[PDB]
């Protein structure tokens, strides 16, 4: 798999979907701070 | 009265001043801003807000 520079690629690979599955969980973690920033400026809001 | 009689005064001792007749206590620049600042909450929740 090295020779054929195949290993490079797997390597590759499997950083990009680790990135990939920590940015989806960090982008639900983004969702809810949004959301509650929403409802408090909602509050915000109602206070204007 | 004063004296014996009427305070001697000026031929023409005009002095108009009265640059204000009653009213001051609040100020009016504070309201100012303040009624700026309204407008511009008002255009705010003209563009759209939330969703």
Do not use: C, W
Not at chain 1, 1 to 13: A, D
Not at chain 1, 23 to 32: D, S
Not at chain 2, 9 to 34: C, Q
């Amino acid at each position: 798999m090295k020779g054929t520079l195949l290993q490079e690629i797997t390597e590759n690979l499997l950083y990009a979907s680790a990135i990939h599955d920590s940015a989806q969980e960090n982008m639900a973690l983004h969702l809810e701070n949004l959301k509650s920033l929403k409802a408090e400026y909602e509050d915000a809001k109602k206070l204007l | 009265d004063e004296e014996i009689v009427k305070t001697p005064r000026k031929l023409v001792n005009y002095v108009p001043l009265k640059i204000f007749n009653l009213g001051d206590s609040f100020d009016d620049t504070i309201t100012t801003t303040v009624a700026k600042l309204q407008d511009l909450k008002k255009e705010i929740l003209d563009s759209p807000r939330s969703n």
